Design a protein around this ligand. Sequence first.
Ligand SMILES: Nc1ncnc2c1ncn2[C@@H]1O[C@H](COP(=O)(O)OP(=O)(O)O)[C@@H](O)[C@H]1O
Ligand SMILES: [Mg+2]
Ligand SMILES: [Mg+2]
Lengths: 548, 79, 78, 361, 464
Amino acid sequence: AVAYSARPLTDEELRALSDVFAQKVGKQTLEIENIIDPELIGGVRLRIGNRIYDGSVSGQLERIRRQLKQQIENYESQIQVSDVGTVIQVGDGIARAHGLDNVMSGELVEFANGVMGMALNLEENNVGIVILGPYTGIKEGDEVRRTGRIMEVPVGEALIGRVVNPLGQPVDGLGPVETTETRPIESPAPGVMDRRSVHEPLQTGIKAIDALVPIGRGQRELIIGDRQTGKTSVAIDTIINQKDQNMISIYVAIGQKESTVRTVVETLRKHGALDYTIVVTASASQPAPLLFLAPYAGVAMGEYFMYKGKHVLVVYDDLSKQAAAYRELSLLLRRPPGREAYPGDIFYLHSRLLERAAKLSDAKGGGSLTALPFVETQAGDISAYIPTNVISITDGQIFLQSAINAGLSVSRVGGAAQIKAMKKVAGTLRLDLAAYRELEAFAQFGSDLDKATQAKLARGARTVEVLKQDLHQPIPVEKQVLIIYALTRGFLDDIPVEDVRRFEKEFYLFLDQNGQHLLEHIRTTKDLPNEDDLNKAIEAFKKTFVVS
Amino acid sequence: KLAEEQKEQIVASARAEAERVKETAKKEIEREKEQAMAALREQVASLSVLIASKVIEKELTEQDQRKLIEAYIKDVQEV
Amino acid sequence: IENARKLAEEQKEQIVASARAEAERVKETAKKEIEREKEQAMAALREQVASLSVLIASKVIXXXXXXXXXXXXXXXXX
Amino acid sequence: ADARRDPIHRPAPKFEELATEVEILETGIKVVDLLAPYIKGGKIGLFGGAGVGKTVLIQELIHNIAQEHGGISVFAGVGERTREGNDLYHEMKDSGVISKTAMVFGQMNEPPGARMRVALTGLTMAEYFRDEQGQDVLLFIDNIFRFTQAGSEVSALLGRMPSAVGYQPTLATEMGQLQERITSTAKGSITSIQAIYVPADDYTDPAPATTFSHLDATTNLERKLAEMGIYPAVDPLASTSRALAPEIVGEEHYQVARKVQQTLQRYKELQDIIAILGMDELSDEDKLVVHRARRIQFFLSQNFHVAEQFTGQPGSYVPVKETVRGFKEILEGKYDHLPEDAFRLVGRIEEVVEKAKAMGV
Amino acid sequence: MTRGRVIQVMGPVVDVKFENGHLPAIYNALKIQHKARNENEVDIDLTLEVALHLGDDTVRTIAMASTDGLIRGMEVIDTGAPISVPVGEVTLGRVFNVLGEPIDLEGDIPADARRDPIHRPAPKFEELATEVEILETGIKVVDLLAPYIKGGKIGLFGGAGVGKTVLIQELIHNIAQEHGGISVFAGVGERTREGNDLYHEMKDSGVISKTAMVFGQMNEPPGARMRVALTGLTMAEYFRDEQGQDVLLFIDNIFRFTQAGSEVSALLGRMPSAVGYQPTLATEMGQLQERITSTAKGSITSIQAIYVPADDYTDPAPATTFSHLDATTNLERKLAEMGIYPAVDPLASTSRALAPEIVGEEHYQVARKVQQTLQRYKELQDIIAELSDEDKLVVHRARRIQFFLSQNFHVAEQFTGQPGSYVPVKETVRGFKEILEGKYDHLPEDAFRLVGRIEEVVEKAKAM
Ligand SMILES: Nc1ncnc2c1ncn2[C@@H]1O[C@H](COP(=O)(O)OP(=O)(O)O)[C@@H](O)[C@H]1O
Ligand SMILES: [Mg+2]
Ligand SMILES: [Mg+2]
């Protein structure tokens, strides 16, 4: 009960104010200890308990707050009130404060410096705060005030084509982001009676994935491999290929290098993929609290579009760095570690996040959200703790070898998420790939009957040469299915294996020239065209081909 | 034939890249203008704050004491 | 074929360089114009800011007070 | 609001009420019928790692059994994928097993407190039928490991000193308090089939090791067998049943199963020396052992009804006597000339003969 | 006023009590300077770094030197800023410690110089370079098979007796002579004998006029060896930002940095992570390595020596440091035993810049062809020690290719006599392409030894 005033107030006025506040608060009597602080010349600033009622000098600073007629003639000044606390501990990124009586769990608090934090534990006379930012400006004795909102991020269409951090603050320097809505970071998943089976294909543009491990809209597929196997390239090619499809892509980078993020954004801008992409970033030099909220910010941004009937795709560039950041944060709070020093709820941390991807029913609107988590292994060990934690959450996996490993890469939902034209030709290709894969195991040095000597080796070698691809050059599904159909039907068997790539390039050129009816029939029907016409076109191309 | 088509494709891609660069430069100029206007507004606001503070200091506080008491009573009633 | 591709690439690179240089020249002209406009608007909107400051102080709380405030603002600027 | 309601927590049945007897339940799976048959009133467990085939086996068993049971069934899903429950609900609604089934769902996205106390709700629902109408009840549990995992997550914040590997001090007590209410008393019976998860493919973890002691028949799935394409991936030597006795299943069945296990163990002993030296440094009897063991290991696989959408084959069902006959013929060297690949993914041995015939031999 | 007082002393860890609302910020520097009042005391000159705010006006700090002789109640001064080291042209040719005081007995830096704080946030997203460039070292094998990238990270897997301190001097010399850059060498956990040897080597070969040196010794408290790399980093950042040069930074062992961090974390009472490391291993590594970038002004390129514990490449420390590296370079003994200098392994060395979209298409193809030929020659060793038709030609070309990778350096001149050369990337690519085509198949194999461009081998053959 202390007042700051420009001049020493009359004792009668002090008594009247004290009685008024005693009646208002709920106390029989109240006494005010007025001060002689001269800086506040505008009026009186009261501090009772942990509540503050401002004076008039702050209004001038509030004038700067009202930077925004002529400001409605400086608009109007009102007695703003706030609930406050004081810091009693700070170190390693976790604070601890007194006060903050009526604070909620998960709320957002603001330090006097300008940084934000989460209210984590509400103890009997304490609040545990996690600092989302630089903690070297916070010292014991500082003041922290409430915001009255659970954690949330800004959402909208103004975020498209921008680079932001997990709190929605732009980092590309193009100016403020003008959104008008928010969504909580922690939100429930769709229920059992809100979903439906996946029945639409998501085209990556890569032949090996589109033919062997198909992905549907609303699925959760995992991409797993060692470092230096190039999964960022797969993500970038998949994002680039969605130019024509009505899809919104979101790219989340966790624990990466900011230079590589810069070059990835430059690659995206070249191919015109920033008209439908949002980038959320938290580099390796940022605090662990920020490295751990980024996937949740990304999914919160995606669900805004998903719950309107639109289709979204979200990429988490590394979940194995989110896990390490969470382990670091939880070990600083002195929680008993489990296997590999990971906490007990490291499975919950990922299962609560990947269960927000769904294919909604037609009563809910019909939207979707696809997810592509990344996990990085050590020496190709797929039976570690985190890899097995995430393998048991998703609907398949794609194992990259230090080149997809078809012995461990599978897709459950896919198969019904494929077009009929590719479903007709994928089976033969799978059998040929298996035939070569097992044959080469023993036939490295050994004579075989002509069957296993040619049909089991040359066909596999040709298909392995066909499955290769180049960077940032995705392929349409019609061309994909046509080349796979030719290979499975039997052409290329008299073409040298050193010329298949040029054969395919020239075949695409011939198609784009004089195969308009074939391509349009495929694009319109989602079924193979007439076999006689296809064979005639392939024979014409083979006749015009100059075999080397 | 195919070589000339590839040359035309390269020319078209270069033209698209140049147009994107031109649009980026125009957007940069617009952003610079917006930032300059914002900075001018900020300087005007700071000068207004300083001059208003000086004027309010020069103003008589004899009635301002009663005004502050009345405003405090009103805020007590409101809260 | 290779010679034609190289010629097309060289012409495309020359066109890109010319477009970038023209954009840089336009940027220099725009920067000069924006600086001149910033200075002129600084003077004009500084007079306007003094007037609006007198108005804001009056609103928070005639000609003679405005003149005194203008003199004080000039002294502060000096 | 006026319907009768029962509390979730109650003590277990006493010693003077249980009933002990062994009858055999038929599933139509060769590796299960032969080497580890199921009991008609006990507890059955399916251990597995991540992505090895617990869910497919659960769905196949549901499809085969729940209709033949003709009684009541309860399905409780704790800590599993929500899309799996959505698929299962519609599959049951299409097949018609609903109107004699009750379902309870607490899944991956729920807080630990909900995942802890969901198995108890299905348990109460089944106990009502058993102890009030004298019926025979089936009980399926989607993953019983999540119950102890959620308990471990809670115990840390409750303020307890951690046990080995970070688990809770009260793992065995909670597991026993849950698992001792699933019994068959003098009134009715409760046949419970449970799927158990193995973290990091470690079978010596505290939770699988503790749960191993409550089971009458167990089924262990291994990733190495699944990597070779063998499906289901049941390990034929580490899966056990208390009903594999000469007086319960018969005398021919017992001898056939024992001989098959013996040949598989002998083949397992010779893996390292084959790996380093090769097959050329073995005696004739050892080569014969390998020749029959590869055929047996491939003939333990099968094609399932619920796996048709993956591969294409319609699916198969084999009674016990046919399985015993087929393995007896295999052990006798009757089919030693056919290629080893003709034995994969077939129902019976006549299908093996047909597949070899269509292969050009 | 703003005076603290010592409360507790437990080895290298100290606690200081301050006044209300006057505590120093985290990472600040505090000074103790005491003169013996009586015969029962000693003189103290100590520096401490703030680590935690424990509450009740108490701050827990780590010490940069020995704490023997501290008495509870001695005054402590709060400087108001982190450790500040001198920067500019005054640091070229001198040797410093973690506090920025010279240790070469050549005088003191004047008190009116400019000093910069040790702790700083990384450069922002909008200030980085949008493209990828290539650093031309001038060494044939490095420039052809494992190219360097401006603003990149390189791991040197060398050792003792393979010629590492000669390669470092050659890099310093070449960069300074051709590009105009400056070099900084930071030795973390350095033996004093080896530091003395390196200093005398650099003074002999003359490069000392272009490089700054910082030493954090093996006999220093864990706090000192944890913050040595930051002093070299902030010495290089001045030349990067203020001038706009392309700067080189050498780190003598990045493993001792993590070990010192783990020791400090254990001293402060923290729960250890997997394999007993600090919980904040990745955060500390990232805070060090994210300041080594290429901005729009200049660039810092870092070469770091890495030791792999227990020969385990999946250990947490090498696994954490390998996710920042852009290239590697391995030195091997037997390549030195054949008289090949530098003894860089041409097949173990890798780089992510060897892609057709960065180095073009001719460079890429020539590099791959050289690698395949060398791999085949390596395969044929068992047979060799008339086998086939093309294998003789393969061996004939491969001997010349393997010998042409050697070079004469400007720092080996003082021992050999030859002037030493600097070979551009276009010239080395053209020479290797011509050798591959066979245009120089009619010369003795010894002519291809310790020369520069492809004309010098022809001249050597002509004169021999
Ligand atoms: N009986 C089976 N036949 C064929 N494939 C199977 C069988 N069981 C599992 N699979 C393979 O395993 C994958 C599904 O594994 P799943 O059972 O979901 O793992 P989990 O053990 O986590 O339930 C499918 O893609 C399928 O290819
Ligand atoms: Mg990655
Ligand atoms: Mg399961």
